[PDB]
Amino acid sequence: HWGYGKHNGPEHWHKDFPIAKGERQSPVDIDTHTAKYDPSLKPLSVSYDQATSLRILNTGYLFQVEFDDSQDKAVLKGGPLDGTYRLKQFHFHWGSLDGQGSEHTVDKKKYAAELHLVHWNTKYGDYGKAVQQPDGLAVLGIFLKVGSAKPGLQKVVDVLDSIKTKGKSADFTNFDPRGLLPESLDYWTYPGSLTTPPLTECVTWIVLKEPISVSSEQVLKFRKLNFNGEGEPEELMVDNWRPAQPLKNRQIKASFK
Numbered sequence: 001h002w003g004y005g006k007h008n009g010p011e012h013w014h015k016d017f018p019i020a021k022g023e024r025q026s027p028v029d030i031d032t033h034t035a036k037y038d039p040s041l042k043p044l045s046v047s048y049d050q051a052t053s054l055r056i057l058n059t060g061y062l063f064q065v066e067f068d069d070s071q072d073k074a075v076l077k078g079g080p081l082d083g084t085y086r087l088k089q090f091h092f093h094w095g096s097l098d099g100q101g102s103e104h105t106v107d108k109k110k111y112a113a114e115l116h117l118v119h120w121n122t123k124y125g126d127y128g129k130a131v132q133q134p135d136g137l138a139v140l141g142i143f144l145k146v147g148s149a150k151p152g153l154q155k156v157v158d159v160l161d162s163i164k165t166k167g168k169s170a171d172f173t174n175f176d177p178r179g180l181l182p183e184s185l186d187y188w189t190y191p192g193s194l195t196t197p198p199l200t201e202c203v204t205w206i207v208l209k210e211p212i213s214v215s216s217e218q219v220l221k222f223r224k225l226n227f228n229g230e231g232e233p234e235e236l237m238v239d240n241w242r243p244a245q246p247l248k249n250r251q252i253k254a255s256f257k
């Protein structure tokens, strides 16, 4: 099965998932000089006031925090988006070293980690139908740099020891994802894909320009997770990022400056 190692990592995925070599793959390098300012884009509307977190899960490839998306609670709209996208979950990708870990890059700069807030287009009724559609998902991407602690991240960090291994979950209620947002909602946007198998080309990417700051100690706790299941040889969950893929004809649009 797929993973991040030499044997089953990103350069192998195309054999099971040929769309890996498709025309709208993610992530990409954001060339800030060739991104076009688009004065017709709207400010992002992030309405997370009624978000209902439920659970945190080690999937074997990352960890994710899941939300109750059975009603229009937390939603993303505006920006490049037509209609309303409902928050389903967030997760992170990160490095073995502070110098790497993000999936998107900015002028080839890698960040220590990248947060993905995943939302589905409510015109498609649920997530499983939305992922079959070319405008099914909107993923809000936020870079993490190592510096000051992010207080809003600590509740996540502190629960990771209870989900060390693949398939472990824990109750994770009353978590407010607004605590993970930077001050500015200036962004880049482009059409792309899931960054893990099945690599479906169903994502409108919205990548915030301003990274959030996390402490070295917070990210080191991400690196103590395990890709393996309990009772199996320990493989640290690090470097679970896909590298930049070819932009091909696509244009990246900037909301700013």
Ligand SMILES: Cc1cc(C)nc(Sc2c(F)c(F)c(S(N)(=O)=O)c(F)c2F)n1
Pocket: 089, 091, 116, 118, 137, 139, 193, 194, 195, 196, 197, 198, 203
């Ligand atoms: C592959 C898969 C299967 C299922 C059932 N949910 C998901 S949710 C999800 C996910 F885990 C991800 F890593 C991504 S990502 N990196 O943001 O493209 C995603 F969009 C998602 F929508 N992903």
Ligand code: NA
Pocket: 070, 071
């Ligand atoms: Na409900």
Ligand SMILES: [Zn+2]
Pocket: 091, 092, 093, 116, 195
């Ligand atoms: Zn992701």
